[PDB]
Design a protein around this motif. Structure first.
Motif, PDB file in Angstrom:
ATOM      1  N   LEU A 127       1.724 -45.713  10.037  1.00 35.37           N
ATOM      2  CA  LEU A 127       0.648 -44.730   9.762  1.00 35.37           C
ATOM      3  C   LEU A 127       1.034 -43.310   9.349  1.00 35.37           C
ATOM      4  O   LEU A 127       0.336 -42.713   8.544  1.00 35.37           O
ATOM      5  CB  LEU A 127      -0.222 -44.564  10.982  1.00 35.37           C
ATOM      6  CG  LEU A 127      -1.576 -45.155  10.812  1.00 35.37           C
ATOM      7  CD1 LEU A 127      -2.400 -44.928  12.153  1.00 35.37           C
ATOM      8  CD2 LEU A 127      -2.171 -44.511   9.530  1.00 35.37           C
ATOM      9  N   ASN A 128       2.065 -42.717   9.952  1.00 36.24           N
ATOM     10  CA  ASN A 128       2.401 -41.360   9.560  1.00 36.24           C
ATOM     11  C   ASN A 128       2.952 -41.424   8.162  1.00 36.24           C
ATOM     12  O   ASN A 128       2.522 -40.663   7.293  1.00 36.24           O
ATOM     13  CB  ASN A 128       3.458 -40.764  10.448  1.00 36.24           C
ATOM     14  CG  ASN A 128       2.878 -39.896  11.518  1.00 36.24           C
ATOM     15  OD1 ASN A 128       2.356 -38.770  11.243  1.00 36.24           O
ATOM     16  ND2 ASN A 128       2.971 -40.385  12.780  1.00 36.24           N
ATOM     17  N   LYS A 129       3.904 -42.336   7.936  1.00 34.87           N
ATOM     18  CA  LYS A 129       4.388 -42.604   6.577  1.00 34.87           C
ATOM     19  C   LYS A 129       3.194 -42.596   5.563  1.00 34.87           C
ATOM     20  O   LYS A 129       3.181 -41.800   4.607  1.00 34.87           O
ATOM     21  CB  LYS A 129       5.218 -43.907   6.493  1.00 34.87           C
ATOM     22  CG  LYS A 129       6.620 -43.962   7.238  1.00 34.87           C
ATOM     23  CD  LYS A 129       7.635 -44.987   6.555  1.00 34.87           C
ATOM     24  CE  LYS A 129       9.180 -44.638   6.862  1.00 34.87           C
ATOM     25  NZ  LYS A 129      10.266 -45.709   6.523  1.00 34.87           N
ATOM     26  N   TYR A 130       2.158 -43.408   5.769  1.00 37.81           N
ATOM     27  CA  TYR A 130       1.033 -43.319   4.838  1.00 37.81           C
ATOM     28  C   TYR A 130       0.527 -41.892   4.715  1.00 37.81           C
ATOM     29  O   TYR A 130       0.468 -41.350   3.604  1.00 37.81           O
ATOM     30  CB  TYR A 130      -0.136 -44.210   5.224  1.00 37.81           C
ATOM     31  CG  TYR A 130      -1.189 -44.226   4.136  1.00 37.81           C
ATOM     32  CD1 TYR A 130      -1.062 -45.063   3.001  1.00 37.81           C
ATOM     33  CD2 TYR A 130      -2.310 -43.395   4.217  1.00 37.81           C
ATOM     34  CE1 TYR A 130      -2.032 -45.065   1.984  1.00 37.81           C
ATOM     35  CE2 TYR A 130      -3.308 -43.392   3.194  1.00 37.81           C
ATOM     36  CZ  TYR A 130      -3.158 -44.228   2.089  1.00 37.81           C
ATOM     37  OH  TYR A 130      -4.138 -44.183   1.092  1.00 37.81           O
ATOM     38  N   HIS A 131       0.179 -41.300   5.866  1.00 34.95           N
ATOM     39  CA  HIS A 131      -0.476 -39.977   5.982  1.00 34.95           C
ATOM     40  C   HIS A 131       0.336 -38.842   5.368  1.00 34.95           C
ATOM     41  O   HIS A 131      -0.237 -38.034   4.651  1.00 34.95           O
ATOM     42  CB  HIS A 131      -0.738 -39.700   7.443  1.00 34.95           C
ATOM     43  CG  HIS A 131      -1.647 -38.542   7.721  1.00 34.95           C
ATOM     44  ND1 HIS A 131      -1.302 -37.526   8.602  1.00 34.95           N
ATOM     45  CD2 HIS A 131      -2.918 -38.282   7.330  1.00 34.95           C
ATOM     46  CE1 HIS A 131      -2.312 -36.679   8.712  1.00 34.95           C
ATOM     47  NE2 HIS A 131      -3.307 -37.115   7.951  1.00 34.95           N
ATOM     48  N   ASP A 132       1.651 -38.774   5.643  1.00 40.03           N
ATOM     49  CA  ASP A 132       2.551 -37.758   5.025  1.00 40.03           C
ATOM     50  C   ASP A 132       2.571 -37.948   3.501  1.00 40.03           C
ATOM     51  O   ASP A 132       2.105 -37.061   2.765  1.00 40.03           O
ATOM     52  CB  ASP A 132       3.978 -37.804   5.604  1.00 40.03           C
ATOM     53  CG  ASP A 132       4.073 -37.177   7.002  1.00 40.03           C
ATOM     54  OD1 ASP A 132       3.140 -36.402   7.349  1.00 40.03           O
ATOM     55  OD2 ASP A 132       5.079 -37.452   7.736  1.00 40.03           O
ATOM     56  N   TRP A 133       3.038 -39.118   3.030  1.00 43.06           N
ATOM     57  CA  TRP A 133       2.859 -39.499   1.623  1.00 43.06           C
ATOM     58  C   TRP A 133       1.511 -39.041   1.013  1.00 43.06           C
ATOM     59  O   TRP A 133       1.470 -38.534  -0.105  1.00 43.06           O
ATOM     60  CB  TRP A 133       3.014 -41.012   1.440  1.00 43.06           C
ATOM     61  CG  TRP A 133       2.637 -41.478   0.039  1.00 43.06           C
ATOM     62  CD1 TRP A 133       3.470 -41.524  -1.052  1.00 43.06           C
ATOM     63  CD2 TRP A 133       1.327 -41.916  -0.442  1.00 43.06           C
ATOM     64  NE1 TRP A 133       2.774 -41.976  -2.157  1.00 43.06           N
ATOM     65  CE2 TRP A 133       1.465 -42.214  -1.819  1.00 43.06           C
ATOM     66  CE3 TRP A 133       0.067 -42.057   0.149  1.00 43.06           C
ATOM     67  CZ2 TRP A 133       0.387 -42.660  -2.612  1.00 43.06           C
ATOM     68  CZ3 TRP A 133      -1.005 -42.507  -0.639  1.00 43.06           C
ATOM     69  CH2 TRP A 133      -0.828 -42.805  -2.007  1.00 43.06           C
ATOM     70  N   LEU A 134       0.407 -39.234   1.712  1.00 44.68           N
ATOM     71  CA  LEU A 134      -0.880 -38.929   1.092  1.00 44.68           C
ATOM     72  C   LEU A 134      -1.168 -37.440   1.139  1.00 44.68           C
ATOM     73  O   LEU A 134      -2.028 -36.951   0.398  1.00 44.68           O
ATOM     74  CB  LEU A 134      -1.999 -39.706   1.757  1.00 44.68           C
ATOM     75  CG  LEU A 134      -3.452 -39.279   1.577  1.00 44.68           C
ATOM     76  CD1 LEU A 134      -3.976 -39.455   0.120  1.00 44.68           C
ATOM     77  CD2 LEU A 134      -4.387 -40.023   2.560  1.00 44.68           C
ATOM     78  N   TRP A 135      -0.480 -36.716   2.027  1.00 42.99           N
ATOM     79  CA  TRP A 135      -0.602 -35.273   2.017  1.00 42.99           C
ATOM     80  C   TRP A 135       0.010 -34.784   0.693  1.00 42.99           C
ATOM     81  O   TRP A 135      -0.636 -34.035  -0.056  1.00 42.99           O
ATOM     82  CB  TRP A 135       0.028 -34.607   3.261  1.00 42.99           C
ATOM     83  CG  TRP A 135      -1.000 -34.290   4.331  1.00 42.99           C
ATOM     84  CD1 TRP A 135      -1.063 -34.822   5.597  1.00 42.99           C
ATOM     85  CD2 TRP A 135      -2.146 -33.401   4.214  1.00 42.99           C
ATOM     86  NE1 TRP A 135      -2.172 -34.321   6.268  1.00 42.99           N
ATOM     87  CE2 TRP A 135      -2.848 -33.454   5.442  1.00 42.99           C
ATOM     88  CE3 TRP A 135      -2.628 -32.565   3.200  1.00 42.99           C
ATOM     89  CZ2 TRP A 135      -4.015 -32.698   5.681  1.00 42.99           C
ATOM     90  CZ3 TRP A 135      -3.796 -31.817   3.429  1.00 42.99           C
ATOM     91  CH2 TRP A 135      -4.469 -31.886   4.664  1.00 42.99           C
ATOM     92  N   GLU A 136       1.213 -35.278   0.382  1.00 39.93           N
ATOM     93  CA  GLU A 136       1.968 -34.839  -0.775  1.00 39.93           C
ATOM     94  C   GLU A 136       1.404 -35.239  -2.121  1.00 39.93           C
ATOM     95  O   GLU A 136       1.529 -34.472  -3.081  1.00 39.93           O
ATOM     96  CB  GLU A 136       3.397 -35.318  -0.670  1.00 39.93           C
ATOM     97  CG  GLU A 136       4.146 -34.626   0.465  1.00 39.93           C
ATOM     98  CD  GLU A 136       5.272 -35.484   1.029  1.00 39.93           C
ATOM     99  OE1 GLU A 136       5.242 -35.804   2.261  1.00 39.93           O
ATOM    100  OE2 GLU A 136       6.180 -35.848   0.222  1.00 39.93           O
ATOM    101  N   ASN A 137       0.782 -36.413  -2.219  1.00 39.39           N
ATOM    102  CA  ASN A 137       0.371 -36.919  -3.542  1.00 39.39           C
ATOM    103  C   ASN A 137      -1.128 -36.781  -3.794  1.00 39.39           C
ATOM    104  O   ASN A 137      -1.643 -36.899  -4.911  1.00 39.39           O
ATOM    105  CB  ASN A 137       0.952 -38.318  -3.802  1.00 39.39           C
ATOM    106  CG  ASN A 137       2.506 -38.339  -3.668  1.00 39.39           C
ATOM    107  OD1 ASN A 137       3.062 -38.044  -2.582  1.00 39.39           O
ATOM    108  ND2 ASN A 137       3.204 -38.666  -4.781  1.00 39.39           N
ATOM    109  N   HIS A 138      -1.815 -36.510  -2.710  1.00 39.68           N
ATOM    110  CA  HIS A 138      -3.086 -35.833  -2.732  1.00 39.68           C
ATOM    111  C   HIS A 138      -3.668 -35.455  -4.132  1.00 39.68           C
ATOM    112  O   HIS A 138      -3.229 -34.485  -4.777  1.00 39.68           O
ATOM    113  CB  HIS A 138      -2.899 -34.612  -1.850  1.00 39.68           C
ATOM    114  CG  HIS A 138      -4.168 -33.942  -1.510  1.00 39.68           C
ATOM    115  ND1 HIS A 138      -4.212 -32.682  -0.955  1.00 39.68           N
ATOM    116  CD2 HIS A 138      -5.455 -34.336  -1.687  1.00 39.68           C
ATOM    117  CE1 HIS A 138      -5.481 -32.333  -0.786  1.00 39.68           C
ATOM    118  NE2 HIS A 138      -6.256 -33.315  -1.229  1.00 39.68           N
TER     119      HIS A 138
END
Length: 138
Positions: A127-138
């Motif tokens: 889950l954090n992996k998804y969430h961090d990734w999605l912060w950046e590519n947002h």
């Protein structure tokens, strides 16, 4: 019509977001368990119980038999049944109000099922992996 972006990490959540019950079940499966082991038994379970309606009806002894030897398969079986009944029968806004669903459950719901992923602060490796990734590519 909230569609979580596909991610290079292929979390099963990304596959089930369109149906909260399944995604939630999925979280009960993955909850403190290898995806190695949990994912094959999840698909066999959705294949056999493709909706809460059917799930809430079943007898946990048979559900367990099918979850064997996943680990605390008894306990997971009883949970799945009781959570499925509550999912349909109770008037809820977040799935944390439901039996069997905890932080992992609720975080997953709010990133993927509804659009609240900025307010979420996961603490699950995948889950954090998804969430961090999605912060950046947002």
């Amino acid at each position: 019509k909230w569609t979580p972006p596909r991610s290079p990490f292929n979390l099963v959540q990304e596959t089930l977001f369109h149906d909260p019950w399944k995604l939630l079940i999925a979280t009960i499966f993955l909850n403190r368990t290898s995806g190695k082991m949990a994912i094959p038994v999840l698909w066999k379970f959705l294949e056999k119980y493709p909706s809460a309606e059917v799930a809430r009806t079943a007898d946990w002894r048979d559900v367990s038999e099918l979850l064997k030897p996943l680990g605390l398969y008894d306990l997971r079986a009883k949970t799945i049944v009781k959570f499925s009944d509550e999912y349909l029968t109770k008037q809820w806004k977040y799935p944390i109000e439901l039996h069997g669903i905890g932080k992992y459950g609720n975080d997953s719901y709010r990133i993927f099922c509804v659009n609240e992923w900025k307010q979420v602060h996961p603490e699950d490796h995948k889950l954090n992996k998804y969430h961090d990734w999605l912060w950046e590519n947002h």
